[PDB]
Amino acid sequence: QALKKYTIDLTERAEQGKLDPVIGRDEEIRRTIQVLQRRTKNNPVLIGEPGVGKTAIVEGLAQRIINGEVPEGLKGRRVLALDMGALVAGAKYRGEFEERLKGVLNDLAKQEGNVILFIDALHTMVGAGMDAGNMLKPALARGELHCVGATTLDEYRQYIEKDAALERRFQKVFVAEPSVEDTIAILRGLKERYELHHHVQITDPAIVAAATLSHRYIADRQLPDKAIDLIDEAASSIRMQIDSKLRNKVTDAEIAEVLARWESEREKLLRMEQELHHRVIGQNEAVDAVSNAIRRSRAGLADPNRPIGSFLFLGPTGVGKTELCKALANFMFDSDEAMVRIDMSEFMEKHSVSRLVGAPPGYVGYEEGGYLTEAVRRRPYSVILLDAVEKAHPDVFNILLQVLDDGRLTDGQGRTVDFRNTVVIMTSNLGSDLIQERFGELDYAHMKELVLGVVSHNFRPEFINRIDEVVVFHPLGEQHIASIAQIQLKRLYKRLEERGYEIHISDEALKLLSENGYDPVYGARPLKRAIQQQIENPLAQQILSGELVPGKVIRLEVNEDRIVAVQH
Amino acid sequence: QALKKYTIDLTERAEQGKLDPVIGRDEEIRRTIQVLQRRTKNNPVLIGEPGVGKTAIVEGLAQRIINGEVPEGLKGRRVLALDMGALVAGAKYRGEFEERLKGVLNDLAKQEGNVILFIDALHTMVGAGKADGAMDAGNMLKPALARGELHCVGATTLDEYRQYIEKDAALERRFQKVFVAEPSVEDTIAILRGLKERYELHHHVQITDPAIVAAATLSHRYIADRQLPDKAIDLIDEAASSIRMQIDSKLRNKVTDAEIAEVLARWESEREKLLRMEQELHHRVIGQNEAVDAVSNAIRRSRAGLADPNRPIGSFLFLGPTGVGKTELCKALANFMFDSDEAMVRIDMSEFMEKHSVSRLVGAPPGYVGYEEGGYLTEAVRRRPYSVILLDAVEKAHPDVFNILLQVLDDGRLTDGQGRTVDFRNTVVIMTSNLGSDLIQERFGELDYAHMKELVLGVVSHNFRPEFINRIDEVVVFHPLGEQHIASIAQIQLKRLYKRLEERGYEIHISDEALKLLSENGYDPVYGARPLKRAIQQQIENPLAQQILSGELVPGKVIRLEVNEDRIVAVQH
Amino acid sequence: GMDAGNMLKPALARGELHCVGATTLDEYRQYIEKDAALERRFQKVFVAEPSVEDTIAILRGLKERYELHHHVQITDPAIVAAATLSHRYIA
Amino acid sequence: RPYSVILLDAVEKAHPDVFNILLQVLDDGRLTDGQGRTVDFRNTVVIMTSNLGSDLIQERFGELDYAHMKELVLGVVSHNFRPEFINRIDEVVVF
Ligand SMILES: Nc1ncnc2c1ncn2[C@@H]1O[C@H](COP(=O)(O)OP(=O)(O)OP(O)(O)=S)[C@@H](O)[C@H]1O
Ligand SMILES: Nc1ncnc2c1ncn2[C@@H]1O[C@H](COP(=O)(O)OP(=O)(O)OP(O)(O)=S)[C@@H](O)[C@H]1O
Ligand SMILES: Nc1ncnc2c1ncn2[C@@H]1O[C@H](COP(=O)(O)OP(=O)(O)O)[C@@H](O)[C@H]1O
Numbered sequence A: 001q002a003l004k005k006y007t008i009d010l011t012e013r014a015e016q017g018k019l020d021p022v023i024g025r026d027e028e029i030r031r032t033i034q035v036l037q038r039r040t041k042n043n044p045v046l047i048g049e050p051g052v053g054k055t056a057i058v059e060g061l062a063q064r065i066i067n068g069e070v071p072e073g074l075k076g077r078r079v080l081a082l083d084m085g086a087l088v089a090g091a092k093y094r095g096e097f098e099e100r101l102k103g104v105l106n107d108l109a110k111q112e113g114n115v116i117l118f119i120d121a122l123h124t125m126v127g128a129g130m131d132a133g134n135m136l137k138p139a140l141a142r143g144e145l146h147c148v149g150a151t152t153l154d155e156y157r158q159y160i161e162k163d164a165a166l167e168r169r170f171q172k173v174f175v176a177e178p179s180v181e182d183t184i185a186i187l188r189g190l191k192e193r194y195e196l197h198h199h200v201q202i203t204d205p206a207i208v209a210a211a212t213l214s215h216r217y218i219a220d221r222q223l224p225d226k227a228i229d230l231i232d233e234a235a236s237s238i239r240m241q242i243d244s245k246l247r248n249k250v251t252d253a254e255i256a257e258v259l260a261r262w263e264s265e266r267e268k269l270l271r272m273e274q275e276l277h278h279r280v281i282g283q284n285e286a287v288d289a290v291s292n293a294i295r296r297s298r299a300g301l302a303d304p305n306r307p308i309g310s311f312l313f314l315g316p317t318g319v320g321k322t323e324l325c326k327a328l329a330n331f332m333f334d335s336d337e338a339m340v341r342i343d344m345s346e347f348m349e350k351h352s353v354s355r356l357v358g359a360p361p362g363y364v365g366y367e368e369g370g371y372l373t374e375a376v377r378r379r380p381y382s383v384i385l386l387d388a389v390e391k392a393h394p395d396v397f398n399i400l401l402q403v404l405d406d407g408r409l410t411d412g413q414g415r416t417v418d419f420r421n422t423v424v425i426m427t428s429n430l431g432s433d434l435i436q437e438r439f440g441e442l443d444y445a446h447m448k449e450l451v452l453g454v455v456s457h458n459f460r461p462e463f464i465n466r467i468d469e470v471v472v473f474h475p476l477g478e479q480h481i482a483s484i485a486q487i488q489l490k491r492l493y494k495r496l497e498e499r500g501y502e503i504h505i506s507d508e509a510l511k512l513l514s515e516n517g518y519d520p521v522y523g524a525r526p527l528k529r530a531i532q533q534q535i536e537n538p539l540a541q542q543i544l545s546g547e548l549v550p551g552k553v554i555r556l557e558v559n560e561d562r563i564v565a566v567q568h
Numbered sequence B: 001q002a003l004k005k006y007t008i009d010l011t012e013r014a015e016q017g018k019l020d021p022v023i024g025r026d027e028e029i030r031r032t033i034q035v036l037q038r039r040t041k042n043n044p045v046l047i048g049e050p051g052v053g054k055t056a057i058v059e060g061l062a063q064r065i066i067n068g069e070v071p072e073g074l075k076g077r078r079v080l081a082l083d084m085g086a087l088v089a090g091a092k093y094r095g096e097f098e099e100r101l102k103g104v105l106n107d108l109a110k111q112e113g114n115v116i117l118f119i120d121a122l123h124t125m126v127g128a129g130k131a132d133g134a135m136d137a138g139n140m141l142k143p144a145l146a147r148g149e150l151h152c153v154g155a156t157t158l159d160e161y162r163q164y165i166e167k168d169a170a171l172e173r174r175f176q177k178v179f180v181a182e183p184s185v186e187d188t189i190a191i192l193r194g195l196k197e198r199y200e201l202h203h204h205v206q207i208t209d210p211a212i213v214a215a216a217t218l219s220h221r222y223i224a225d226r227q228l229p230d231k232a233i234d235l236i237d238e239a240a241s242s243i244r245m246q247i248d249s250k251l252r253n254k255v256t257d258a259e260i261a262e263v264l265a266r267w268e269s270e271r272e273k274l275l276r277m278e279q280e281l282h283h284r285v286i287g288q289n290e291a292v293d294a295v296s297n298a299i300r301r302s303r304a305g306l307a308d309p310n311r312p313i314g315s316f317l318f319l320g321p322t323g324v325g326k327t328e329l330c331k332a333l334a335n336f337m338f339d340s341d342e343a344m345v346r347i348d349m350s351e352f353m354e355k356h357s358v359s360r361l362v363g364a365p366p367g368y369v370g371y372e373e374g375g376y377l378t379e380a381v382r383r384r385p386y387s388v389i390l391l392d393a394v395e396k397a398h399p400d401v402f403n404i405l406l407q408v409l410d411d412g413r414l415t416d417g418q419g420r421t422v423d424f425r426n427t428v429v430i431m432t433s434n435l436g437s438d439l440i441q442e443r444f445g446e447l448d449y450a451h452m453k454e455l456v457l458g459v460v461s462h463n464f465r466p467e468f469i470n471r472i473d474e475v476v477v478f479h480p481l482g483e484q485h486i487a488s489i490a491q492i493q494l495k496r497l498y499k500r501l502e503e504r505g506y507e508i509h510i511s512d513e514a515l516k517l518l519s520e521n522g523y524d525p526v527y528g529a530r531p532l533k534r535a536i537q538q539q540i541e542n543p544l545a546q547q548i549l550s551g552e553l554v555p556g557k558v559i560r561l562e563v564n565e566d567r568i569v570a571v572q573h
Numbered sequence C: 001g002m003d004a005g006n007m008l009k010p011a012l013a014r015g016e017l018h019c020v021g022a023t024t025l026d027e028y029r030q031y032i033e034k035d036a037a038l039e040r041r042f043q044k045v046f047v048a049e050p051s052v053e054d055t056i057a058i059l060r061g062l063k064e065r066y067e068l069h070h071h072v073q074i075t076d077p078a079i080v081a082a083a084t085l086s087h088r089y090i091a
Numbered sequence D: 001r002p003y004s005v006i007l008l009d010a011v012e013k014a015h016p017d018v019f020n021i022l023l024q025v026l027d028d029g030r031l032t033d034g035q036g037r038t039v040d041f042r043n044t045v046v047i048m049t050s051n052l053g054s055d056l057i058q059e060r061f062g063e064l065d066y067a068h069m070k071e072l073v074l075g076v077v078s079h080n081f082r083p084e085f086i087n088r089i090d091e092v093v094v095f
């Protein structure tokens, strides 16, 4: 007998109750029963993205055969899972695959149509060295074999729709990936078997939180596969926490730990403006607007078919543009440089646009993606930084129309890029001196209206209609940039404590460092690099000269024109 | 029992102490027991590396079973291992080995959740049983995987997993990537201390703990084929057997680290590195001793570590005419620090004068020349992250070169146009030019080196930006080598020529006057010593190869390279 | 030609066998490092190609062997020329 | 046959990632083939033909000597080939 060498009787296993109580999927079982009762072409092929429980559909079919929920043409059938990996096992010689396969087909003809065959992973059957479609193909055609195929959508349209004969001997039954609520119903169906195996209890709020977090924070794996993965691994984790040396009920906190490893954010975002002024002082208005945008995004009030932040940053450099972006991605999601910076001074032509979107099919930069779109397809929860967007060719703003309205961009390889989890930041200088010359005792609203009119003469009318809010980036005064220099001295003290030194300063040295490179026309970044050079050259040179010892009072005392470092 | 016929019980051997004690790997055993006590995905597979203790994790698991340190669910479990050739011992018939394997699987179904099966080289067992009118191992165990009658534990390399188990469907979703980390040095020390007693009681010798840390450190430092911790265990046991041979043939038992060094060489850093540097410089490169000492100072100030490691090591402008061994200096730096000739990067910037500079060098925009090429600079450092970079002819640059140079001298870490992150801080960046070389060819004589350096640095400040050259470590001067260094380098060329002629079977000594004719004919201030090489080739070897084939020069004579009025002649005496 | 390896390879995990192996680098890299069920029963004795010195020594001993067969006087310049010219002009 | 003459005729028509194979050849004389091994090229005479300075040499060979013409057409070749490659040529000649 060749069936017992290679098949697995599913209905006999469901008779002993080893299979899963498949709950749901009723219309797919009904369409499969419609297919298996035709005259010719009785062969459904279950098609969907992987993980969605297609073997579960055939297990439910076998359980309906055991119970008798089938029509009066399927009572008494046997469902036999065939193993295409097992027929190509000893493929040494000529005509040894065909011996096994013809033994299977003779024994299926022997049963007089009483056996539903289940050939999972149907893409195996096409390439078998002619081979394997051409012995099943006439018996598939006449409907005297009842092969329930089951294969991936992409494997189906890559292997089987290439071959039209084997394609028409089957019939598609498209399997919809289940919803979040349907996953909840699945887990409520399968709670009892896991609580009777792990001997623990499972809390139902942790179940619905597990399904919700699995659907939200995992995009590769699909429901219910990732959900039952999280439940099973948390059940085993609680099993070993009991079984080591103390809870038996799984909470959703353990679910979140398994999700992150493998809600005080509300209280943080209430003080998010304080969090943004933790690292950059001054520029209250952009802090308020960005904190409002993040609060509306985490509150979910905003339209979820839009990006988070459409913000046109203006004004001269060094007023706290990129430091704000770094601390924003830090206190928002992860880090100062878990982001993307794009220098838009590069892009100045039409092939610039084809660079940042991606080359079309048949051209040079095709297989190596775009530049924007690849950088976002790597990091879907990130921050996009367009350095000097005014320097661009004027058609890049058409791409950014698509970006800032729809949150989707279609690269050159023909796929879409999701922008509904990132923040677009655009830096410009179209009104820098206009705000510098009129910052004194002129308010925020009229300055915004003036620079809005100027940039509206600069930019297209379609693109200015897409922005959430255009901040001004007013020039900071003497005490503001002096406090910025104080913050730079504090983070320099942090870096030297990372180096392992305790270095003091004179207040006169602080005043000279604040008055080295102060300019409202370029920002604090000349002041930053001036302090950086005038400290990192002589002090770290005296470190390399063999003077400084970790644990001595090191006062940055003033010279006549310089700053001397002492050892006391 | 067919299990008692040709399978291996590991728990009986751990109960009888016939196995290796395992110290470490607590996290991996804990995650393995997380993976085992499930209902779906019951079988783990130990993805590891060739020699990182994949067998030792299951050995320690069986020892925790015997010692009862396991959780309650795995108490009483008997881990039986699967043995290949024992099952293929007496089985050649049509259906004898396969019937044996089926009886093994019937026994595994019979024990009813009591036996964990362990299979080393899982992919091999899936592709082993090449029989006739029969079946293999993989597609007979494959029913037992997705039927719950097997609590299997796998062990394989990552690559054969990524070929043979990720490709399948049921074999994929019945197996779990319990990744095994390659252990650290001090973890290897702890493991060797856990097994020092076994080897000492075996070989009747003693093992020193400084020898243990020296063996572990130098095994991770030098050995590339094997991995931790197996190479250290092999070094310990090979040293033990070598001391046993010293007892036997031609009286010690304490294995010291000197024995480890003798075995490993038959198979320390800072000041020795400094002295080897400062000595081995003068062998290849002749002269330029100011630059020798300056590179020695830069090496000291870089490897002190007291500065910022957020900047690359090399920031050097090397000035002087061509033919002074700038390439020899770069190759000497590679020969010491990275120990090769072409452990280096030479890029000639005398062609990127136009706008197409960052495109060709760093990485091109698509639709251009360098885009289907990779990148002359950043993809070169992708090829050699651990190397030295040379920038010839920095004076032929473009304003979109200095931007790359400013980003390098600030950071070292860099990103090309495609958008991937490179870092330069393990490398050396060397630039060269020849702007002030006319002044150096004019008045290097009767002038010093310090004010020479300051004056040519002023010339650089005429040509370059001060803040750009502010980030340079040091600029040295390559003087025009005139008489004795020319004599030495022509002597080197003649040494290799003498070596080839002596292996041919002649003996040639040059006159000093003929070497003076080489110096006057091969050296020029505008080029240096490349006309030295081609003039040596022409004026020596072409009459010499004319004469040797001529049936004139008998072996065994001192062939004096005398002088003609303007030629160099090879005479016999 | 079960035939030999399933009768001798099990003795390696039986301790009855103390064999000495000999193979090319290619068969160790193809048929033994892939054969991972037997990796820690062997040790890679990397026999290197001998240099010109050891070649000349081996050729002197085998000169003493070969002069009983060809009945010739092999001269030592021919030995050093054989070692050198075989090292250079044959890859 | 290790002692042959290798003619690489009209080499400037080739695609510029064929010259890297020839960089291996003119660097070391060993060349890694497809099957894996290496082939000793240190007994061959590798001769390449090209005409990259056609208009230049037809225009200016009069009133110019051999060395300056070699320098000028070598600069043209430097625009075409690599300087990593034509440094490894033993002797460019100019017709
Ligand atoms: N309607 C359902 N009722 C009960 N369990 C389900 C249901 N849908 C899916 N599952 C479970 O989800 C998992 C999916 O099992 P499989 O059918 O083997 O996976 P799949 O959906 O077929 O995807 P592939 O391509 O076979 S990996 C199993 O644990 C099923 O028990
Ligand atoms: N000190 C030296 N010792 C030995 N050979 C040397 C020495 N200096 C120069 N040479 C030789 O002279 C050659 C000159 O080559 P280069 O180093 O390229 O000359 P250069 O002065 O660096 O001019 P460029 O810019 O590199 S073309 C070297 O390749 C060596 O063969
Ligand atoms: N912690 C440990 N305790 C005991 N033995 C160990 C330990 N780590 C490594 N070993 C030894 O090193 C060897 C390496 O094992 P493994 O990585 O499984 O080899 P392979 O990679 O060839 O399968 C083991 O056979 C074991 O004897």
Ligand SMILES: [Mg+2]
Pocket (backbone or CB within 6 Å): A054, A055, A120, A150
């Ligand atoms: Mg399936």
